[PDB]
């Protein structure tokens, strides 16, 4: 079967662990993937490393055929028809040719040498600038007050939509920026943050999981405060690592929602 989720995980996960793969790009359910690598010939040694993607019905290597001359420059691709029914089209482009390529949807960049494209900038993650950093905190805490007012005014649905759509998503960006700090990579969270489980450790996923709680007004306050706790943690971690000023939004809003939560 293998859902579009499971398939993407495999390709993204593969690239992440392979040191020759520096950049990954995307584009019927067919998959169009491109790995920009350091040593193209390395992959060409043999076809064992391909077994990781699963059992296949058959495969075609367009630039390695006698009957059909190769004419895809320095590329080398594979067309695979998987047993589960999925079809993949994987191209191996030399990393040195990324610039040319770009010029005339990136998923992962391990070096970030080049600068480039974007309604997807919503999911794009890379080292924040002092300003971008401040922006994430500004939005987080500000929209956060909407959730407070929602719960205090009996508009739990109003509160829930802002929590799900803005507050938690910014906590995630903050966490992604932290991960990006470790490695120094740039990547996408994917449509609806679908790739985040593939970046967070199990501890970090459990923390994010803990921001979800069953229905109820009090359960909501809990979810919100949990996001608070985690946002401080990661924004402090990030601000500290890049030497950016820690905002005062935390403190200001903490006093605020505390004022309303109690009295």
UniProtKB/Swiss-Prot annotation:
Which enzyme type, at the first EC level? transferase
What does gene deletion cause?
Very slight reduction in streptomycin MIC.
Q: Which Gene3D superfamilies match?
A: Beta Polymerase, domain 2, Nucleotidyltransferases domain 2
Swiss-Prot/TrEMBL GO biological process terms:
cellular response to streptomycin
Q: What SUPFAM superfamilies does this protein's entry cite?
A: Nucleotidyltransferase (SSF81301), PAP/OAS1 substrate-binding domain (SSF81631)
Enzyme Commission number(s) of this protein = 2.7.7.-
Q: What more does the entry say? A: Although this enzyme can be purified from B.subtilis, the bacteria is sensitive to streptomycin in vivo.
Instruction: State what protein this is by name.
Output: Aminoglycoside 6-adenylyltransferase
The organism encoding this protein is: Bacillus subtilis (strain 168)
């Amino acid at each position: 079967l293998r859902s579009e989720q499971e398939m993407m995980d495999i390709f993204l996960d593969f690239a992440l662990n392979d040191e020759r793969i520096r950049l990954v790009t995307l584009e019927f359910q067919d998959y169009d993937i491109s790995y920009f690598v350091t040593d193209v010939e390395s992959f060409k040694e043999n076809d064992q490393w391909l077994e990781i993607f699963g059992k296949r019905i058959m495969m075609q290597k367009p630039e390695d055929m006698e009957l059909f001359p190769p004419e895809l420059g320095n590329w080398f691709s594979y067309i695979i028809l998987f047993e589960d029914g999925n079809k993949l089209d994987l191209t191996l482009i030399p990393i040195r040719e990324a610039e040319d390529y770009f010029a005339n949807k990136v998923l992962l960049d391990k070096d970030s040498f080049i600068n480039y494209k974007v309604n997807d900038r919503q999911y794009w993650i890379k080292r924040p600038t002092a300003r971008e950093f401040d922006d994430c905190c500004n939005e987080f805490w500000m929209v956060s007050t909407y959730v407070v007012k929602g719960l205090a005014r009996n508009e739990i649905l109003f509160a829930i939509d802002h929590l799900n759509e803005i507050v938690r998503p910014n906590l995630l960006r903050m966490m992604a920026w932290h991960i990006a700090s470790q490695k120094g990579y740039s990547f996408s969270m994917g449509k609806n943050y679908k790739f985040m489980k593939r970046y967070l450790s199990n501890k970090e996923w459990e923390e994010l999981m803990s921001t979800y709680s069953v229905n109820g007004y009090q359960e909501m306050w809990k979810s919100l405060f949990t996001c608070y706790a985690l946002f401080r943690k990661y924004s402090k971690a990030v601000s500290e690592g890049l030497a950016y000023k820690y905002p005062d939004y935390d403190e200001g809003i903490t006093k605020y929602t505390e004022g309303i939560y109690c009295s």
